[PDB]
């Protein structure tokens, strides 16, 4: 995952499709074009 990089507990999640960190607001904003309701539920919303 993310070549054993760890994210940001809370404001990132490692995006498996990029194994990249990527920011929380962006996939769970639904103003934005990353917007994505299932990624932002099972790897953003708890940690907020």
């Known amino acids: 995952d993310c070549h054993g990089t760890i994210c940001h ?3 990132e999640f490692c ?3 990029t ?3 990527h920011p929380c607001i ?3 904003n639904n103003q ?4 994505d309701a299932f ?3 099972k790897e953003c919303s ?3």
């Open 9 to 11: 507990p809370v404001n």
């Open 32 to 35: 934005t074009h990353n917007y």
């Open 39 to 41: 990624l932002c539920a």
């Open 26 to 28: 962006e996939v769970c």
């Open 46 to 48: 708890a940690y907020k």
């Open 15 to 17: 995006y498996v499709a």
């Open 19 to 21: 194994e990249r960190c």
